[model samples]
Target: SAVDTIRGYCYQVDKTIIEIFSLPQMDDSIDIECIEDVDVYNDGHLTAIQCKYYESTDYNHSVISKPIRLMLSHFKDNKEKGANYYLYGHYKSGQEKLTLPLKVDFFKSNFLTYTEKKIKHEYHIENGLTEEDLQAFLDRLVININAKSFDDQKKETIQIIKNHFQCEDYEAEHYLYSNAFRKTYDISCNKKDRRIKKSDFVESINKSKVLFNIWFYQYEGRKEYLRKLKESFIRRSVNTSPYARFFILEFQDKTDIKTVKDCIYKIQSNWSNLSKRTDRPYSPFLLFHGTSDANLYELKNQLFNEDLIFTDGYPFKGSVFTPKMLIEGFSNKEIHFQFINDIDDFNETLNSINIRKEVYQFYTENCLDIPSQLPQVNIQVKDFADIKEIV
Candidate 1:
C-alpha cells in the first residue's frame, strides 16, 4: 500500500504536468493539492481533478465512493463559486461497473451512498443536499474509470515533454521529465499559493539539468535505467576533438581487474583522437577512486604487458610534479592518457588545464568530491561493467 501510495503521488505529478501543458492559454493556472489533487482554471471555470491508481484490484463502487463524497463536500462549501469534478483512475479489470455519462440516480446510489457492518451512509443527506442539487452536481462530474496505466500514463507525459521541446526521448525523460517531477512535487509541498500558471510551470521545469530523484530510479529499474543513460548520453554519440575529458571513476570492492581494464581501454579507445590535426588533437584524463596503489600498478602492468602505455602524471624518478609534465604528457604518441593517480594531483592537473574540460564521474558506492567550479557530469553506475557499456 505504501508503494502504491507513492505511485499514486507520482501519477498525480504526471497529471499535473500534463494539465499545465494541456491548457490552451498561457495565463491559465492550476492549484495543486488544493481543492483536489489538481485544480485547473481555464476561462474563469474551475476543473478539480482527483487521480487514483489501483493496479492490484478491479474497479468497484467503493473505490469511487470516498472521492465522490469529498468532491460533494467541496461543492457544497463552494456552491456560489462552483467547479466541475473528475475522478481519473486505473483498475486491473471490471471497468464496466462504472458506465460513462452516469445518470443522477445511478451515481447517487453507487458512489454517494454506501454501507458498512449494518450501518448506512448517505453523502447527500450528510451534506444537506437535495435530489435536484445532487443531479446538478452529477451533471458536472466525470468518472474516468479507464485511466492510463502507470507506465502508459508516464509515457504519455514524456511524449508531451518531448513534443514541447522538440528533443529526443532521452532528453525528454532524463532532463525535462525528471525536472518536471521534481518541480511539481516541490511546488506541491512548499508554495504558499500552491497554484501556478502554465507559463510559470513550464519555466520552472525547463530551468535545470540536474536530476536527483529516487522515484524516477525506482520506476525505471536498474537494468533499464542504466541502459537508457548509457544509450542516451554515451553510446549515441562520439567524443569529439579540442575538448579535454577528465574521468573520475569509483571502483567498488570485489570488482575484477579485467572489469577495470575494460573500463580503462573503452574510454581510451573511444575518447582519444590522435589522427586529427595538431591543433585539434586530444586525449582523455583518468582519476580512479577506491583504487589502491598496488592495484593501480597491477592494472598498469597488465595493460603494459598488452603493449598499452599511459602516464600517471609522473615523468621520471625523483622528478618534481609540474603542470608542464601533464601538459606534455598528451604530446607522446605512445601514451594515450595523462592519468592522475592521486586526487591532489588530479585537482592540480584539472586546474592547470586551461581548455574546455568536460569531466565525467562514474561511481558505484561513493562519489569522489570534486570542486563545484569544475563542471562535470556525475554518472552513477551499477558496476564497473556499466562503464564499459557507457564508454
Candidate 2:
C-alpha cells in the first residue's frame, strides 16, 4: 500500500508533465503541488487537478467523495478567476457511474455526500454551499474516472514527447521522460514560485543527455531501465568520436582493482584512435571515483607491469597538474591513456582543453554528480564485471 501511494504520486507527476505538453499555449505553465496535486494555468484559466490511481478496484462514488469535497472547499476560498476542478484517475470498472455533464444533484449526492469511517458526511452542507453554488461547481468540474492505466499513461507521455521532439521512442522515454519527471519532481518539492512554462520545461530536459532519476528508475524497474540505457547509449557500433571522451568511473565495495583495471584497458583499447595512423590521435580521459590511494597506486603499478602506458596529468610527485601535459601526452606514442586523480584537476582539465569533451559515467552504487553544464552519458553498471561488458 505504501508503494502504491508512491506509484500514485508518480502518476500525478506523469500527469503534470503531460499537462505541460497538453497546454493550449507554449507560454502556459503548470504550478506543481500548488492548488492541487497539479495546477495548470492556460489562457487565463486555472485548472486545478487531483490525480488518483486505483488500478486494483472498480470506481465507486466513495472513492472520489473526499477529493470532491476538498475541491469544493478550495473553490469557496479560491480567489483565482475562471478556475476549473478536475478529478482524473484510472480504475478497473464502474466507469459508467460518472457520466459526463454531471448535473448538480447527482454530482452532489454521489461525490459530495458519503459515509467516512461509519459517519455520514455531506460536503455541500459542511461547506455552506447552496443549490446555485452546486450548479456553478458542477459547470466547471470534470470527472475523468477512467483515465489511462499506469503503463499506458507512461507510454502516452513518451508518445507525446516523441511526437513533439520528433525523436525515437528510446530517446523520448529514456531522455526526455526521465528529465521531465525529475524536473517536475523537483518543482513539486520547491517552496517558492514553483511554476514552469512548457517551453522552459522542454528546453531544460533536452539540454542534458545524462540524467539519473531514481523515481523513473524505480518506475521502469532497475534492470529494465539499465538495459534500455545501455541500448540507447552503449551501442554495438564504433562509438569512438574525435571529441575528447571522459569516463568518470565509481568503484563500489564489490568492484575490485583487477576489474577496474580491466575496464580501463578495454575502454583504452577500443575507444582510442591512436592505433589508426590515418585518424586523428586521441585518448579517453578517466577520473576514477571512490578508489583508495593505495588501491589506485596498485592499479597504476599493475598497468605499468603490463607495459600499458597511461598518464595521470602529473610528471612526478609534488608537480602541479596541467591540462596541456595530458593533451600533449595523449599525442605521444608512448602514452596510451590519461586519467585525472583529483576531481578539481579533472574538471579544470575538461574546461581548459580546447577539444570537444563527451563524458560517460559508470557506477554500481552511489553516483557522482558531474557539473550541470557538461552533457554526459550516465550508465548504471549492474555489477563490477559488467563494466567491461559496457565498455
Candidate 3:
C-alpha cells in the first residue's frame, strides 16, 4: 500500500518534470486498441522498452504482469506492420536481471501458483489473462507441483530421523534428539528452553536445526545475492553521509539468546566502520524489530547500557531521533533517548519542530523591520532530552 502511494507520487512528479521541460504531451486518453507493449515513438520510429524500478529484493508477480502483457502485444502488433521491436528491461533497485524468455517463465510460474491457490490470486483478476499470463500460469503450476515434492521429501527426512533414533514416537523424540543432536553437529539451537510437549513434536521437527540447515543450504544462491547487496552498501565511500540506514529484523517465535547477540554484533560492526570516517557526521541506525514482550525483554537485556536508543512499546508511533535532539545530545556529550507510543505522538513532535522554526524565522526577519530601539539578539535554544547518559 505504501509502495503504491509512493509510486503515484512519483508519477505526479514525473509528469510535472515533463511539463517543466516543455515536452510535447500526447493525449492522456489516447488508447490504441488491442495494444500489448509500451513504445517510445520518435520521428515515425517505434522503440520498444521494458522498464522497472524496484526498491526491494522481494519479487511480486502482479506488479509486472500488465507491463509484460503489453510488451507481448506490442511485439505482435509491430511484427504485422514490419516495425522494429527492441526488448529492453531494467531493474532499478537490485541487480537481478532476467532474459525475456526467463522473464516469461518467471511470470508463468507465479501465475500458476496463483491459479492453484499456492500463492495469492489477486494479481490474476487485477491484471487479466493474456498469452503471457497463460504461459506464466502454466509454468507456475509446474513449479508449484515440483515444490510440493519437498513435503514428501520432508516426510522421508523425518522417517530417517525416526529410524536413526529407533523411536516409534518420532515427534517426542525429535525434540529431545534435536537438542542433543544439534550440539553433536556443532549447530546451536538457540532455543530459550529445553522443555518439550507431545503436541509440540511435529512443530519441533518443522523448527529443527537440520531442516533449517537443509533449507539454508538449498537457498545458498539467494543468500549470496543478499550478501552481495549488503557488501555493495558497505563498499560505498564513507566520506559522504548516507540518507538513512534501514534494518528490518523479524523475531522468530522460538528465538535463542544468540539471536539478539547476532543482531547487536551486526549493528555494532556496521556503525563502527561508518563512524571511523571523519568527513561525514554520524547517522542513527533505524532498527525495526517485531517481537513480543518476552522477546523484547531479551532484546532490552542485550541493549541495556549500550549506545542504542529505542522507542517504547511494540507498535512505535514516531521515530524518536531528531536533528535537534542529535545536536543537543552531542553538545551535552551524552547519548540521548526518547520514546513515543504512537504515530500521532511522532507527528506531534515533528510538527512542533516545524512550528518552532517558523516562529523563530518570522520573529528574526521582522525584527529588522521594527524600530532600531528593539533588541536584535539572535536566540537559539535546544530542547532538553528526556533521557541522557554519557556513553
Candidate 4:
C-alpha cells in the first residue's frame, strides 16, 4: 500500500541525498500525524517530500488533494522561505522522465492555466480542491517530483556517493563502495550492468536492521552516542572530501596572518558548486575557521583514514599528511615552505570561466632576499601535495 510503503521509500530517497551531500539532519516525520514522509535541511533550505507508492495499482491525480493542499499551504504561508515540496514516488507512465509543477493545470478538470472563473468554481466550490485561493496560491514555489524506478536513480546515486568521498579514480572507487554495500546487505544482483526495481531494492535493504548504525548505538549509549558523533560541517574525512590529505602547518602554533587570509579564500571559493579541474593548478584546499581543539583532534582522526588509489610505481602504495602530531604507524616527512615575496602571486590566477590558465603571470619586478620573516609566512606559497614513498 502507498500509505504503508511511503514512509520507508521517502526516508531512503531523502537519506540518499543527505549522505551524498553530507546534509545535517534527516528526521522521518511521516510517523508524526498530519506530516510528510521525510524532511531534510540543506544549507537552511527545507525540502519536504510526500511519498506515493502505487505498485500493481492505479494512480489518480485527484488522490493527492490533502498532500497538495498541505504543500500549497506551506508555500502560501511561507513563500519567501527556502522550502520545496515534492510528491516523490515510483515511475508511472512517462512521468519517469520528467516531473510536474504544482500548478492548477496539473490537476484534473483544471487542465488549462488557472483562470479566475475556474478559480471561482474549481478553487473554492469543489469538495476536493487543493487550494481555496487560486490567485494568492500561485506563489513562485516550484513543486517538482520525480517518479523514477530505483534502477533509474542508481547511476547518479553512485556518482553522488563517489563524490561524497575524495578518490583518485571514480570508476574504481564506485566499484569499491558499491561492492561494500552489496556484500554487507548480501544483495546478489549485479547492479553494475543494469537497473533494479526500486521496490525490490528497498525491500532487500529494509530487510537488514540498519545493522551497523544500530549496533553502534548499542556500544555507545543512545543519548551520548549522538552527541559524541556530532557531524562536522567541513570536509575532514574521505567521505566528505576525496583529498582529505593535508599538512597542518604549525607556524609556531599561531595560524599565520597569510595562512589565515589564504584559508579564508579557500573556504569561500565555492568548491561545493565547482567541478574538480586538472588542466591547470587549482587549489582544492578548503579551510575551516576557529576550530576547537576537540574538533581539530577529530579532524586529524578523520583525515588520517586510508584510501585506495592505484599507482604505476607500486604494487601497494598510499599517502598521508602529518604536521605537529604524527598518526599511528605513520611518520612525518620534513617539508619546507619555499619562499616568495608577493604572497598573492603564489595563488593560481583563474580567468572568468573559473578555470586556471596554463600559463602563470609574474606581477612584480623587484626581487629581495625573503628569509627574514620566513618562519611565519612560509605556508603561503602553495597547496597540498602527495609525498611519494621511499620504496
Q: Quantify all predictions' global Cα lDDT against the true fold.
A: 0.70, 0.71, 0.32, 0.32
Clashing residue pairs for model 1: none
Tens-place lDDT per residue, model 3, 1-391, is 2222222222222222223223223223211111212221111122232223443433355555544444445444343443222222223332233333344445555433354346454343454556564553333221111111223333544454565445555342333233333232221122332332223332333322211122122233344532432332233233234333322233344556564455445443443323433443333322223346676565665565565654332333464444455333322222323233323433344433322111100111111121222221111111111001100
- The lDDT, on a scale of 0 to 1, for candidate 4 is 0.32
- The regions of model 1 sitting more than 4 angstroms off are 1-143, 146-172, 179-224, 235-238, 276-279, 372-374
Clashes of each: 0, 0, 9, 2
Task: For candidate 4, write residues 1-391 as lDDT tens digits.
Answer: 3332334333344344334234323322211112232322111123344556555544545444555555555665565554334455553443433334444444534322234445533433443334444534544333333445444454555555555444334332223333334332232222242223333333344211111232223333444433332221112122323221222222222333444434323432322222345222112322232335554444333322422111111122363222112111111112111111122322321111132212111111122222232211111111111000000
- Give the TM-score comparing model 2 with the true structure, all chains together: 0.55
Q: Rank the candidates by lDDT, best first.
A: 2, 1, 3, 4
Runs off by more than 4 Å, candidate 2: 1-3, 28-30, 35-93, 98-143, 236-246, 250-285, 289-299, 302-359, 362-391
TM-score of each: 0.55, 0.55, 0.27, 0.28
- Cα displacement (angstroms), candidate 3, residue 295, comes to 2.8
Ranking by TM-score: 2, 1, 4, 3
Model 2 C-alpha lDDT per residue in residues 1-391, reported as the tens digit of each score: 2244345556777887788888868885566553333321111122245567777788887777766776677678763444566667788778887767777768767877777788877877976778787787777776777778778887888888888889865667677777787678777656677678877777777754456676555556566656666677766333766777888887844457776787888988877887757457777778876767877777788888899887876787888876787888777767888878878888678668776777788776667777776656775544666666556
Model 1 error, position 157 (Å) = 5.9
Write down the TM-score for model 3: 0.27
Model 3 lDDT, residue 76, Cα? 42
lDDT string for model 1 (12-37, tens) is 67887798888878885556653333
